[PDB]
Design a protein around this ligand. Structure first.
Ligand SMILES: *[C@@H]1O[C@H](CO)[C@@H](O)[C@H](O)[C@H]1NC(C)=O
Ligand SMILES: *[C@@H]1O[C@H](CO)[C@@H](O)[C@H](O)[C@H]1NC(C)=O
Ligand SMILES: *[C@@H]1O[C@H](CO)[C@@H](O)[C@H](O)[C@H]1NC(C)=O
Ligand SMILES: *[C@@H]1O[C@H](CO)[C@@H](O)[C@H](O)[C@H]1NC(C)=O
Ligand SMILES: *[C@@H]1O[C@H](CO)[C@@H](O)[C@H](O)[C@H]1NC(C)=O
Ligand SMILES: *[C@@H]1O[C@H](CO)[C@@H](O)[C@H](O)[C@H]1NC(C)=O
Ligand SMILES: *[C@@H]1O[C@H](CO)[C@@H](O)[C@H](O)[C@H]1NC(C)=O
Ligand SMILES: *[C@@H]1O[C@H](CO)[C@@H](O)[C@H](O)[C@H]1NC(C)=O
Ligand SMILES: *[C@@H]1O[C@H](CO)[C@@H](O)[C@H](O)[C@H]1NC(C)=O
Ligand SMILES: OC[C@@H](O)[C@@H](O)CO
Ligand SMILES: OC[C@@H](O)[C@@H](O)CO
Ligand SMILES: OC[C@@H](O)[C@@H](O)CO
Lengths: 605, 605, 605
């Protein structure tokens, strides 16, 4: 007769549970603990890197442009038969007694060349001292001077050749590279001797490819400016090497101080040293890097030419404290040195707040414990350290915040059990069915709960009695409707009344005193049945009623994917191209010349 | 007699609480609010970088190979006494009237060299014009031409010398670098003048190291191809510089347009400008970068030679809109220019959706507000920007999703209080003990709760009466068992009955009407006691019963650690090595020659 | 009379709800599902990169220093008129019959130069064979030998010139670059022929710029050491190219094996191949990189000179398995080759655990499915791959852990509904007011809930009756206080008693049997009212009572912002500077010489 309007649901008959099946709620579980926070040491650090810069210094070249042209005289013209150009090494004595001394040069070259002592007279006249004037102007140039301007050629009248001599002096830039046993000039000439060669200290062990009299060292030299004529106010030690083609002078200075194989790279006001995994971590918050190192300091003794390290190390460390923690913190021992992957040498100065000044004694002892010739190689890319630093910092948070939640969760559950405990006491069925993940019947046998599964009844095989007032015992009116049903389609018809959430209770025992304005709704099928004044009215669907929710919401979204495409500022080729001249490309073209423009096989007779 | 089988637990006696101790549940707390979302401006952007590429252009060299050999004649052989090679600067007039004009050269050189006007006749014959033929073949070469192939040497019959002259013309590649006041050829020769030198416009202020008649500028030049003989269809302005060793010609073109000190680097269809921390952010989603900048635009006026910037800037910006937002969006003003860390110049075109077209007026005003000679230096690494971009994007999510949860949590708690409120009303003890984190006794004094701590009773000092049926008042049967106990080992024996979770209630007041099939379980010690038909049966352990849980699970795992090792494609050395010839290495070896193979000290007599 | 002491709150009158308004709790929602985990293939991989290294090999130069000086004799001095230096190509026959054969050279040069067969006699004496002695010492040098030490100059007695001849032999280093059709020496001389030129195999198709008799190839050559005199134990194929200035010999070896255009870069013991988005992913956990590729293998056939690839590919792959999975896993087919963005060629060997050995047949078929002249260009930066790898790994976790929580949340809610269901049954008002987010009145009409909003009553317009014992029916004593009030300020005074949380119930129906020690607290205003023995005592504030909480706590903090500043080890300039000599800088200075020190315009007569 009155069948379910909404069929998108199920019905259940839950017969009383015997001691057949009984379960117990799990007890509160043990909660995880926030990890003991990492301990960080404050400290200052300076980071050094393989020094790739060459040694630089000033030098002065003295030499002579010795030219000899030969000329054939045509009836109405002239033709060079030859033009011989050479370089004469102005000698020690002329550089001291003539040039430096008075600012003049002789007009004559006299040197060895191919094992013979040749000699050139300017214009082939008697020797004549000539004042040196600055070279002509030119953008981007060291200083320079010369005596002669033009070239002297023989007249038709006449020594069938013409000789020219131009005394030249330049303040070239010198550059040398490790091992620094030879150096180079601005002109492109090598000089096969150490820039630190000399007679003072152990400097005489330095390298040299030349005989002893080539080299000479004036001890107490006041050079005078060739433009201002001024005299040096302080003396130096002037070195003078005389090669076959020139005499080169610079100021000798002690080696060790002058150079270094590592380069101070960065200053980190707040470098943090963490201890983990049998290694150290040096996170520079500002620089966004984290260096990894053994727990053993590095022997600066093992370093080849590293005087500058501790020099700068202290300077920066002394200078930094004086500004940042001049009175904020206190040093904990002496600077220390560690070598990180990437070949970065970290000098570290462990700090300590005035707050925990009590801990000084202990700390100190654990720092001095770390205290125990070759070159260090440095990678070009610091990327891995910034990755490390980055990844670590994020991982840290993620884990931290997440951990905290895992706990907040656990605890929450433990407590909520105090709520399910009493709740099952109320509707053992509701609670039970929501614990076994299925519809069951259950009752309380003391402190445990007995259960028994329910049987699904067809949605078609359920019918609602039309009234709710008992004819037999008037003055009484049930509170829950009555129904009929069959577990099978062709099956018999069973009596019983309705219960919460489509439970077809067999025994019709629920009744209340009859009343007026007694209208109710009942969970019937996929919707509700509407009874008014203890008598049926009509059916509905859940859609007809305004919903409210018991769930706090949460809109979690995924961090979506992202592709990192190859991206580069300057490609390799751009860089190569960034050089105005290319030796290789040119050489290749230069040496092709006679192949493209001549004939290198034919033999004439 | 009947003692606890499972001893891994505790018992408690909770005596009624007086007004001595009373507490109140905390009220719902104030929840945090989702931060006002960041506002992003849509826009197009082009990124420029310090231009490191040299200026390139085509040039043509004209010069002459002037050779003079001298030969001694042996009885049965011949030996060169000398071989003098030089370069003659074909002069302006010959390049215009002979070469370019007819495709021929003279067989004679006539130039200044060492302040004398020498002259060479090919084979020392009368002057003779000679057609230029292409140079021989060679892989990877500019074009070239010449008149002569072989070298003329004197016979034993005879001017005791032989003269050769080969007119050479090459279409070399020229390259110049900022400040562009001088340039270089493909052969390796410098030319100390600006490629933009000339007589037109302000070009005459350009640089030059040569006298005025060296340089000449034909205004209206139709060059003819030396291979195809074709004549140029359009005239140019042919420059011609005549150096001591050659005459070099190229086409003068105005400077400013021709060059630039910044290089268009990338085009970003969707560049996003965010405003934060007194700076801007330019995230290129595609390129995975984020640039940081002041909120003030950059003066392109301040830029040295940046004509190309706005040139390309517009081009790309006009071209991009036309494709992407041709009708999707609308421009919001004129392109703007900002300078980011790393020295990347960002030209930006703020966009706007047709949707919010109403906001045009306001936006425009806030963009025009930003509108207000030196070179910009660019880092080689864009890594920090990709790190920035990366880190920012992840941080964003993390914070966002996490924030949302913190709230969902708060709210959840607030509501659940409506559940604890009523629950304590049920089992004030259970709820109380789970709020003070310890076992206590409590009752409800109106709206507050009175409490009093419980006393722990030894697990050994507890005993269960064997029956549950009162002899005095048969027909009645308690619902909770009875027990005995002592707070001390040597202590007296106290009477009382059992309660939920090992509570030893002193007063034995819980009783129910006697029934059949009345079996129950009771929380006794580390397990349960089993009573059947109001009479003891046996004890158990919680292990014997199937557990169900009231906790929703969560399997949170840590993001584990990871080490980023130094990783590099090409090391520094590999790069250096990538050059076929090494000037330094060679020079070093070349200049050693006379040290290894001769004797540079001995003087013969 | 007795008004609220604490006014920081509100009062409400909740009149019974009719069927006017009725709502329903939302049903449990459908929960999201953990995504099907990504399937990863185990495998070994080797990564190759554009080979930028030049080809290297050893070579030997044989040539002669032919010098001719001319000397004028002064009365008391001597002057070089000229010094002509040249290089003579020791010929094939002399290198085989004299030098290599006996370790001696002739004292005479005889070669073509400028199309004439000149000849030099050492000191102009009869020919004389001379043993070659090692060159002098010099740090960092290939081997070398020579016959002569000094230079022979003419005496005043006399052929008015002096001739010198020094036979030179050096074991130079050779270098060639793709296309490898020409190579270079350590001295700086080009040799325009392929290092792989010869007569064997197809080698004769190799390049050459020289006539056929220049080149000669001895098939079966036992070179003898010029220092140890030892003879080679095994013969080679000695090549000998005779250029105009020297004869250069090396050992011919087949091309293809000798070179390669890609360079084995890294070995990845555990490379993981993921399949996604129509592409592959190759995450190297160790190297912290992830490569992206099409799902189609790459044709090694398409590779120009890649013999070495598969050579090394197998070697590493065979060598690795043998160590790691020698018996742990099993190979799944033949090595495969893919090309990733960045131009990295990935050779991959899919693996498989002995565990799932059953799946072999299927897998194999899906791998062989992927199996199907130009050079590959490689970026210099691997950063994007490490970013990819990094970002992906973090994203993975975040999403994963978060997803899990979203679920744990959903479920939690669904269940808790079983708790709100029964709770509303208890205090329909409390529960209702905490579901509509506002204070309302509600009752249960069967399975739905009827509601009706409450009316706010002024905090000023509320008053508490002083007693709680009814005079009319003594022996009885209400459980809840009584009050008076007005909805308006000037309004009438309404009777009614107090309820939970400031609800002003109109009907005074709550009463209990009178008792002693009957003290209670009541939620009155911003605090409590204290009644003792059914008679008023005093008021309080919530501050006076010790609070306990029903909320599990959670301290979520934000991951804070961080700025990644431009950071670089060596700048671009530092790198450029890292070269001891700079061809460009020098050339620029060299070619300026005659501008600064002479006069290149004046013509003398
Ligand atoms: C921090 O210091 C304490 C005291 O030495 C130590 O026990 C603890 O292990 C440290 N924290 C961590 C994360 O190791
Ligand atoms: C640390 O010691 C290990 C030996 O276990 C060595 O391999 C490594 O080179 C050292 N690391 C540093 C950076 O000192
Ligand atoms: C969840 O949040 C995202 C933004 O992260 C938003 O796009 C989406 O509309 C939100 N979902 C709902 C149903 O509000
Ligand atoms: C977005 O725009 C509104 C309106 O100007 C502004 O008030 C708000 O601050 C902006 N959002 C953020 C994150 O600042
Ligand atoms: C922005 O202005 C600051 C001054 O506060 C200056 O130091 C910085 O160079 C400027 N940044 C950029 C990228 O314009
Ligand atoms: C938790 O998840 C991880 C994978 O992230 C898994 O390895 C582990 O077995 C899980 N724990 C349990 C108990 O399921
Ligand atoms: C893993 O393998 C199964 C079986 O082929 C497949 O159905 C599933 O899609 C794979 N997992 C993922 C993430 O695709
Ligand atoms: C893959 O194929 C696409 C065509 O859709 C092509 O553009 C790309 O170059 C290929 N990628 C690789 C790395 O092979
Ligand atoms: C929350 O945790 C942070 C550390 O992440 C801490 O600084 C802060 O004090 C904590 N808040 C409280 C109230 O404990
Ligand atoms: O004068 C051009 C000549 O020096 C060539 O060898 C340049 O490559
Ligand atoms: O002929 C070799 C000679 O030029 C050397 O100086 C090369 O280093
Ligand atoms: O002797 C110096 C001369 O060679 C210059 O051209 C160097 O730049």
């Amino acid at each position: 007769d009155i069948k379910a309007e909404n069929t998108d649901a199920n019905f259940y008959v839950c017969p009383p549970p015997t001691g057949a099946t009984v379960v117990q709620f799990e007890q509160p579980r043990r909660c995880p603990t926030r990890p003991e926070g990492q301990n960080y040491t404050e400290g200052i650090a300076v980071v050094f890197k393989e020094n790739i810069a060459p040694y630089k210094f000033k030098a002065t070249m003295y030499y002579k442009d010795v030219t000899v042209s030969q000329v054939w005289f045509g009836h109405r013209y002239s033709q060079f038969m030859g033009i011989f150009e050479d370089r004469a090494p102005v000698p020690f004595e002329e550089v001291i007694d003539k040039i430096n001394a008075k600012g003049v040069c002789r007009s004559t070259a006299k040197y060895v060349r191919n094992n013979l002592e040749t000699t050139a007279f300017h214009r082939d006249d008697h020797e004549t001292d000539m004042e040196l004037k600055p070279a002509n102007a030119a953008t981007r140039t060291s200083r320079g001077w010369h005596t002669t301007d033009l070239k002297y050629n023989p007249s038709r009248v006449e020594h069938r050749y013409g000789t020219t001599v131009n005394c030249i002096v330049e303040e070239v830039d010198a550059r040398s590279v490790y091992p620094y046993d030879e150096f180079v000039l601005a002109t492109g000439d090598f000089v096969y001797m150490s820039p630190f060669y000399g007679y003072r200290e152990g400097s005489h062990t330095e390298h040299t490819s030349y005989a002893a009299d080539r080299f000479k060292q004036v001890d107490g030299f006041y050079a005078r400016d060739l433009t201002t004529k001024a005299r040096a106010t302080a003396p130096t030690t002037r070195n003078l090497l005389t090669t076959p083609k020139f005499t080169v002078a610079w100021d000798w200075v002690p080696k060790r101080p002058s150079v270094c194989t590592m380069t101070k790279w960065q200053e980190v006001d707040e470098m943090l040293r963490s201890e983990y995994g049998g290694s150290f971590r040096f996170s520079s918050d500002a620089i966004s890097t984290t260096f990894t190192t053994n727990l053993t300091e590095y022997p600066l003794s093992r370093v080849d030419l590293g005087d500058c390290i501790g020099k700068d190390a202290r300077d920066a460390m002394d200078r930094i404290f004086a500004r940042r923690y001049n009175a904020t913190h206190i040093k904990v021992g002496q600077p220390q040195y560690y070598l990180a992957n990437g070949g970065f040498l970290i000098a570290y100065q462990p700090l300590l707040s005035n707050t925990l000044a009590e801990l000084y004694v202990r700390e100190h002892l654990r720092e001095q414990s770390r205290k125990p010739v070759e070159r260090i190689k440095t990678t070009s890319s610091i990327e891995f350290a910034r990755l490390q630093f980055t990844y670590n910092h994020i991982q840290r948070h993620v884990n931290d915040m997440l951990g905290r939640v895992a706990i907040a969760w656990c605890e929450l559950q433990n407590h909520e059990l105090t709520l399910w405990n009493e709740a099952r006491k109320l509707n053992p069925n509701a609670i039970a069915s929501v614990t076994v993940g299925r519809r069951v019947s259950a009752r309380m046998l003391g402190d445990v709960m007995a259960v028994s599964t329910c049987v699904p009844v067809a949605a078609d095989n359920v019918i609602v009695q039309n009234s709710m007032r008992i004819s037999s015992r008037p003055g009484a009116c049930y509170s829950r409707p009555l129904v009929s049903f069959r577990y099978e389609d062709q099956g018999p018809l069973v009596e019983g009344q309705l219960g919460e959430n489509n439970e077809l209770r067999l025994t019709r025992d629920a009744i209340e005193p009859c009343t007026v304005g007694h209208r109710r709704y009942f969970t019937f099928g996929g919707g509700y049945v509407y009874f008014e004044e203890y008598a049926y009215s009509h059916q509905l669907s859940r859609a007809d009623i305004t919903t409210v929710s018991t769930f706090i919401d949460l809109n979690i979204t995924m961090l979506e994917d992202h592709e990192f495409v190859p991206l580069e500022v300057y490609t390799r080729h751009e860089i190569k191209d960034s050089g105005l001249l290319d030796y290789t490309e040119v050489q290749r073209r230069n040496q092709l010349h006679d192949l493209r423009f001549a004939d290198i096989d034919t033999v004439i007779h």
